[PDB]
Design a protein around this ligand. Structure first.
Ligand SMILES: CC(=O)SCCNC(=O)CCNC(=O)[C@H](O)C(C)(C)COP(=O)(O)OP(=O)(O)OC[C@H]1O[C@@H](n2cnc3c(N)ncnc32)[C@H](O)[C@@H]1OP(=O)(O)O
Ligand SMILES: CC(C)(COP(=O)(O)OP(=O)(O)OC[C@H]1O[C@@H](n2cnc3c(N)ncnc32)[C@H](O)[C@@H]1OP(=O)(O)O)[C@@H](O)C(=O)NCCC(=O)NCCS
Ligand SMILES: CC(C)(COP(=O)(O)OP(=O)(O)OC[C@H]1O[C@@H](n2cnc3c(N)ncnc32)[C@H](O)[C@@H]1OP(=O)(O)O)[C@@H](O)C(=O)NCCC(=O)NCCS
Ligand SMILES: CC(C)(COP(=O)(O)OP(=O)(O)OC[C@H]1O[C@@H](n2cnc3c(N)ncnc32)[C@H](O)[C@@H]1OP(=O)(O)O)[C@@H](O)C(=O)NCCC(=O)NCCS
Ligand SMILES: [Cl-]
Ligand SMILES: [Cl-]
Ligand SMILES: [Cl-]
Ligand SMILES: [Cl-]
Ligand SMILES: [K+]
Ligand SMILES: [K+]
Ligand SMILES: [K+]
Ligand SMILES: [K+]
Ligand SMILES: [K+]
Ligand SMILES: [K+]
Ligand SMILES: [K+]
Ligand SMILES: [K+]
Ligand SMILES: [K+]
Ligand SMILES: [K+]
Ligand SMILES: [K+]
Ligand SMILES: [K+]
Lengths: 399, 397, 396, 397
């Protein structure tokens, strides 16, 4: 259903390394990470200046203490002009991909010719909340609310952590502790393999952290999590969400993480005016939702909807990015859609790379473009579930 | 601009009363206020069921402790289906209007036929933050950050409150304390006049609060009755001691509230034979230096008029959001818009400013002004911290 | 065995009004209340200058955010000389009486001739704690600890509120909810009758809160709250459904301070002071922590034996009412008839500023002795953790 | 003097290692440290059982979050009977010594024959405070108060940290940065020499910390090893930038630790045929202007000596607590006490200053100094914030 509308081209993309929780990038705020990703993306487009960017959509979930309009801070921090229109987007884990859809639509309705879209998250710098200080609590202990748990990882209706709802997925779709563990080992191995072959080198923009008080500078170059794989330890670890007989574990779940990613989108007209070389074309997209506790399999709706919107058959896709909120999320959506694992997350997924929730929808699209390049594919599809019951998906053609 | 693209119709709108800070609505969360507006807006459309809504865009600025995806909680709380696509939008004070823009665009690209959009804010329930508990602070007094100040009212680059940058507006454009106060008095008078004549009755959906106390219905905006002109002219300034021109009476307050609009495509309007209230003619976002956000509407409003193919003179009524009295004064001066065409039922200085909601709140009020004043063409413009503004042009049908 | 040691004389006493939680006195800090009672107590001794006070012992339980040495701030706030030796004492609810014992001992060992002792508590201004901020806590909800609950009202071992162990007392010694309610009503009425008769007027030093208009606080805030039928119908407070302990038949949370002025035999003679009373003896005792409620049944006999005074020769007792059941159980255990217990009401009706109550009941006891024309009094007060303190006095 | 009061004997003492701030003992609470010291001190008395202890006085300054009656928790944690009378004492840094004085007095008035006294502090586990949650604060950032700073280290009248009032001491009595620095190096050298010679082995009760982690034993004080004379003389001042003379290396640190003594009457000493370690000869408290607390020992020490019937020249060893290097220098100047008789095994600048315990810690160390150096008469003095000091004189038997 998109072919009757103006075309939207990706002319570049970039991402930070993904840092572990309280880890390599924990000194940087979410706008600093997003600015880094936006600046790096634009630096790759010869013939396009940062001052050409008219509008920004940037995902961010746990915005507490980030300050006014995280997307605007990202844009100005990146060196974009003060004239740039900036909107922050929250569709929990789908934020980064919905931001890109919104950027594409803004080109399609004629209101921009150059848009930067993506997402950022600093889970390390998510604060705690004191909820009752204005009116007071006269007597009794109080709770300091962990903002990650409250605004990122707990389903609002059932007050269940995403991890507990992944257990519901395992039960609904018949995936044992062992199948999830072997999936996680495989995705770590793919991430380590791509890392070692240099296959993330182009998409990653290393971060230089200036030393303080004479201390040496630090360059963060690679994702922090992939090296953590220890197969023997992973198979023996205790469950994370259901004691004893739980199947979901910290090793086979996505971690908490810091990172950002950005894509640069241009209209057909701007591509011709500036004689730009496009990397990919956006073919279509789809959002879908169902029962909140079944958010884990919402991609099974979004992906067919995105393929239909793009006019592409599922069998024509050369590579899928199915975001690994949990290992069981990938396994269940592959099962429901009949997609073989050999076509899914070819450079590993968020279980091994990390899951900065506001950035991951854009992070996986950046990685998808690198997969299509390295594996000489043409058609890709990215899908990512989000807490609350939804998912977003997008189809790209590598040019 | 927009005339080459599919039409988008507003088939209804609704808003909560605007409650004062820690006031009439402080017991309700932002999604409870949002659900209330959404539900009330859909109840007005004869022939459209809540299950027909496909997608929601809802503004919300200070989202700390609201929980996962405020917009999704608004939608589910309103009785929408679990299949509904929900996104929360933050463009600070322009959030509720940008949400409506994104909703219109989603109809225009063919991805939805029925969209609900608007915004909500519970400033009363914004928490305080403890920023460094994960890594620890070994020794020394720490600080608890007020979420309203940090994420709502402080410009990130300068670390200045909006009211301090409103003083910049008064100096840049030469508006005295007296000019700002008399503006504020006039907009309170217009709000009180509209209240007494029942002109907000249609747009407001009253809220029923279960009582240890009797049961309370909140039917009115809480702020308009506070006008005391003698006290207003005598009060000390709020942001610069001694020489300041900006005061709490001539500034917008902190407030709680939500507002929603229902958007449909041309095909859906015809399939269901729905009666549209208005048509969206065009919109425009603009931005400039962050500390000059006060006059970004002087950019966004011409841009939206150009997108709509409408001349500024053909507009029958404007809503220029009153972040501060000086904001309305400065944009009227720069654009050459007479005050006789501006905020005809009062603005946010008198009505309240729940920041994530106000962009949609002013559009709901504009539709009422157009009907009451027998206007056809309306334009709403709202500035936002960080240097931005958003504006929207509508035609009353 | 005090008859062979130096005699200790009470030449005066004074207390603040006792304010309700977050109530009449909640704008004052604990040292501000303490300073008020100290200065007022000294104002009644003609011929004793505040600069004559050599040493201070002052009780205080929830000292968090009060600042360095609450007792020293009380002394300096009251106008005492910077040469004054100042120690803060925490024996939970017994702090104000143990402080008086320690002051009397410092007279007896010859290290001072003029001592001020007593207690203060501002439960209103007790803070909340954030315990793991130094090392940090990486992921998960944390707790803000109510300092009243943590440092004042919870037994350290069993980790249970005092009210829950008051339920133990009701069970162990067999006192129904009805009996506890009937005792609460009797002590409220006595407090109201002493109040209406002006019998608290001399011991209370009214507090002036400057504004816009000034506010004078003259009376205890709690006694008036009595509502017999509402009291008899309220749900329990520590065990839902079957509980016998309620907020109306328990002590409240309160703010207040109290002070007494002690001198030696020699100083009394030197400046020709008129003593109000003489300390005859004291006793501290302790037993099982959850049984703290009947620890005064050990400390009251110990104090009487130390004073060389029989239990039946006592004209009035102050048995502190941590809960109504505490007074009933100690009356039952010691064979004390209620007719000579808390004749102007007790903490259930007057309030329980925990660091001050040990001195508050002694000041009230001295007033009961004058009004009822008695000579011998004994004050006993239990404290969380399992202990109790008691003191025997003779009205001169 | 105390010649007219009954005799009070010390039959044993013991202390924990002194751990650094957030250091080797940071996992232990104040009552766990106190109970450890009490239990070890009683273990040294052959013929006295723990069930024989009748009353405890225990110092503790920053008692926030420690729970009801820290002294009672120390006593029960040590295995004392539930019949033990327990009182917690706060005279700031003098707490541990005022506690011993009160325990002696309770023996002297006949109310006990066996008393345990001392003090404890876990500065590592002092919390932060939220001061106005009960009443609320409607709008604006709030402050968390560090309990160490508020309840341990700030003069209440002037709101000055102790280290700032230490500079006053340096200016009042004319001690330069260099003199304070050379003093600190000397006391670190003395602490290290005592350590290596095992002179602390008797007084210290090592602490066993369980780990599937391997178990760790803390046997030494953590601070003495930190001496770096080069860094010390070049470090920047800690309380007055630029011109200041007081530094972190020449000040006492923040620390954890506890210490205890066991006291008996003459009758109980005879009944049980106990060999006493020492006899308490006298004591004295004194106080002056709060900001001049650094020199309050110069009143308390002569007062204690007069109470004990001992001339100053008769004393074989003094413990003058090193709240700061300048504090020991000033008191040696005022009293004419040569340094050759002061803190012979080092002081709190090198050993640590767990403030609620230091008053008892220096008496434990003093008894070791008297034995090691063939002395008979010793005097400990310790100042406290607020203007006070406490001092006590003992005879080694
Ligand atoms: C909206 C959406 O997208 S839905 C999903 C959104 N995101 C989420 O829900 C986040 C899910 N993940 C989480 O909540 C957190 O990462 C948690 C709770 C699972 C982590 O729990 P933790 O116990 O703190 O994880 P942790 O990193 O400490 O690992 C625990 C153990 O597993 C070990 N381990 C971790 N990863 C591996 C690995 N690949 N291989 C072997 N061992 C591993 C660790 O070494 C550790 O062992 P140890 O502590 O005994 O030394
Ligand atoms: C301005 C602000 C700080 C209010 O501060 P405040 O001191 O708490 O304001 P108050 O409501 O207490 O009003 C103060 C006084 O003015 C009086 N007052 C308020 N409105 C009045 C009116 N219309 N007429 C006469 N008097 C009025 C009040 O009665 C009060 O009197 P008092 O001192 O005797 O109590 C706060 O509302 C604010 O920050 N507004 C800006 C919000 C914002 O920036 N939004 C984003 C914009 S881009
Ligand atoms: C027991 C305790 C938790 C009370 O909690 P609380 O319910 O908040 O106390 P309140 O004053 O609010 O009482 C609540 C109700 O009781 C009523 N009430 C209280 N005292 C009353 C009285 N004398 N007569 C009639 N009604 C009374 C109140 O009117 C109120 O009614 P409401 O439900 O309409 O509000 C608290 O006061 C406490 O812990 N006291 C013990 C203190 C202590 O342990 N000290 C140390 C002992 S060792
Ligand atoms: C003085 C005080 C503020 C310490 O400040 P601090 O800077 O946080 O402590 P530090 O350990 O970091 O010391 C600062 C520097 O001096 C170094 N240092 C400490 N002891 C040293 C020593 N003996 N030799 C050489 N260097 C030393 C430290 O290694 C550190 O060096 P760095 O800058 O390279 O890290 C704190 O300990 C204090 O307030 N003490 C007074 C306690 C008190 O008042 N008690 C009551 C008295 S009445
Ligand atoms: Cl959703
Ligand atoms: Cl902006
Ligand atoms: Cl006890
Ligand atoms: Cl003092
Ligand atoms: K470029
Ligand atoms: K690169
Ligand atoms: K993992
Ligand atoms: K309807
Ligand atoms: K209506
Ligand atoms: K106003
Ligand atoms: K007098
Ligand atoms: K009086
Ligand atoms: K009561
Ligand atoms: K023994
Ligand atoms: K030893
Ligand atoms: K030091």
């Amino acid at each position: 259903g998109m072919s009757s509308l103006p075309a939207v081209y990706i002319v570049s993309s970039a991402r930070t390394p993904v840092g572990s929780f309280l880890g390599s990038l924990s000194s940087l705020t979410a706008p600093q990470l997003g600015a880094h990703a936006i600046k790096a993306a634009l630096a790759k487009v010869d013939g396009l200046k940062p001052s050409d960017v008219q509008e920004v959509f940037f995902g961010n979930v746990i915005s507490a203490n980030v300050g006014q309009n995280p997307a605007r801070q990202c844009a100005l921090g990146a060196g974009l002009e003060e004239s740039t229109i900036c909107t922050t987007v929250n569709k929990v884990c789908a934020s980064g991909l919905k931001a890109i859809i919104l950027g594409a639509q803004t080109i399609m309705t004629g209101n921009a010719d150059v848009v930067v879209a993506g997402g950022t998250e600093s889970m390390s710098n998510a604060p705690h909340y004191l909820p009752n200080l204005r009116t007071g609590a006269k007597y009794g202990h109080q709770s300091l609310v962990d903002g990650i748990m409250k605004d990122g990882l707990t389903d609002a209706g059932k007050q269940e952590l995403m991890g507990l709802q992944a257990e519901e997925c395992a039960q609904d779709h018949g995936f044992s502790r062992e199948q999830q563990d072997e999936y996680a080992i495989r995705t770590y191995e793919k991430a380590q393999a791509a890392q070692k072959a240099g296959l993330f080198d182009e998409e990653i923009a290393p971060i230089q952290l200036p030393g303080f008080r004479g201390k040496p500078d630090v360059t963060v170059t690679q994702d922090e999590e992939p090296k953590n794989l220890n197969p023997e330890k992973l198979r023996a670890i205790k469950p994370a969400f259901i004691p004893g007989s739980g199947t979901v574990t910290a090793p086979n779940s996505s971690p908490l993480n810091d990172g950002a990613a950005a894509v640069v989108l241009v209209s057909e007209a701007k591509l011709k005016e500036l004689n730009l070389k496009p990397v990919a074309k956006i073919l279509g997209w789809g959002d879908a939702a169902q029962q909140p506790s079944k958010f884990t399999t919402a991609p099974a709706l979004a992906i067919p909807k995105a393929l239909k919107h793009a006019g592409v058959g599922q069998d024509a896709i050369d590579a899928f990015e199915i975001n690994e909120a949990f290992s069981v999320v990938a396994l269940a959506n592959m099962k429901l859609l009949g997609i073989p694992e050999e076509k899914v997350n070819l450079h590993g997924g968020a279980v091994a790379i990390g899951h900065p929730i506001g950035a991951s929808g854009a992070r996986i699209l950046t990685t998808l473009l690198g997969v299509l390049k390295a594996k000489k594919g043409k058609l890709g599809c990215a899908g990512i579930c989000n807490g609350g019951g939804g998912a977003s998906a997008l189809v790209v053609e590598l040019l």
